[PDB]
Paper text:
CD8 is expressed on the T-cell surface as dimers in two isoforms, the CD8αα homodimer and the CD8αβ heterodimer; both consist of an extracellular immunoglobulin variable (IgV) domain, a stalk region, a transmembrane domain and a cytoplasmic tail. Here, we report the high-resolution crystal structures of chicken, swine and bovine CD8α and confirm that they are capable of forming homodimers. All of them are CD8αα homodimers, and each CD8α exhibited a typical IgV architecture consisting of two anti-parallel sheets. Our results suggest that although CD8α and MHC I sequences change drastically during co-evolution, a few conserved key residues ensure that the CD8α forms dimers and interacts with p/MHC I during at least the co-evolution of endotherm species.
Three extracellular Ig-like domains of chicken, swine and bovine CD8α (cCD8α, sCD8α and bCD8α) were crystallized and diffracted to 2.0 Å, 1.8 Å and 1.8 Å, respectively. The sheets of CD8α are composed of 10 β strands, but there are 11 β strands in sCD8α and bCD8α because their A and G strands are divided into two separate parts. The two artiodactyl CD8αα dimers also have some distinct structural characteristics, and the most notable feature is that they have an additional A’ strand. The two artiodactyl sCD8αα can be discriminated from each other by certain characteristics, such as the longer A’ strand and shorter complementarity determining region 2 (CDR2) loop in sCD8αα. The buried surface areas (BSAs) of cCD8αα, sCD8αα, bCD8αα, mouse CD8αα (mCD8αα), rhesus macaque CD8αα (rCD8αα) and human CD8αα (hCD8αα) are 828.3 Å2, 979.6 Å2, 928.7 Å2, 1048.7 Å2, 1105.5 Å2 and 1026.3 Å2, respectively, indicating that they are tightly binding dimers. The BSAs of sCD8αα and bCD8αα are similar, but there are six hydrogen bonds in sCD8αα and only two hydrogen bonds in bCD8αα, indicating that CD8α dimerization does not mainly rely on hydrogen bonds. The Q residue on the C strand is involved in the formation of hydrogen bonds in five CD8αα dimers, but it was substituted by H in bCD8α, and no hydrogen bond is formed at this location in bCD8αα. The numbers of residues composing the cCD8αα, sCD8αα and bCD8αα cavities are 7, 7 and 9, and their volumes are 202.0 Å3, 322.9 Å3 and 384.6 Å3, respectively.
Numbering used by the authors:
A (entry chain A), B (entry chain B): 2 to 115
The structure:
């Protein structure tokens, strides 16, 4: 499964809104999509952020919905929004879709401060 | 020494990721591999893009790792990735390997816009 990322990278600033989108290049394989991010550090694992579908956005435990959310824009377009960028928001953002029990990952989007 | 290219060709779009792979079909001949490009026009010469190996990717001087990179992914498989396709990324991509002072070249992979 292929995705197009809009934008493909972002240099942001503290306090700024950041809006990311991933677009599935094929439809009908899933109704939902997850956003994840990898935080630079010694832990190589990604961090689950949210699951987006026809239902309300489901945020990862402990996340502030005032700060981070997302939306299913269409059957193939998914959006993530950071309302006011914080230092800890820096990382590599990507989408994941499960289809036929296979985890697929979009390309990653580096979102960093100067 | 022969190469297998995956894919053999690609029609891309602006802002899409492009991932190419070339696999050496004979083991034990080289542990490194170069990606080159040919663009018809004013300079027919093979243009060096990167040398992949056990070491970090060695990009040609002037290339931006935020746009172009690659990786050695097995003993024989080598990959080139464009993060966001640009008009200027169009052309014929191919791999080259040296073994016992003998230069080898893969088939050309056309990567173009509609």
């Amino acid at each position: 499964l292929s995705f197009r990322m809009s934008p493909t990278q972002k240099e942001t600033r503290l306090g700024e809104k950041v809006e990311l989108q991933c677009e599935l290049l094929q439809s009908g394989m899933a109704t939902g999509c997850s956003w994840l991010r990898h935080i630079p550090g010694d832990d190589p694992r990604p961090t689950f952020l949210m699951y987006l579908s026809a239902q309300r956005v489901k945020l990862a435990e402990g996340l502030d919905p005032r700060h981070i959310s997302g939306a299913k824009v269409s059957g193939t377009k998914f959006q993530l929004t950071l309302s006011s960028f914080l230092q800890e928001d820096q990382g590599y953002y990507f989408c994941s879709v499960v289809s036929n029990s296979i985890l697929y990952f979009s390309n990653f989007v580096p979102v960093f401060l100067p």
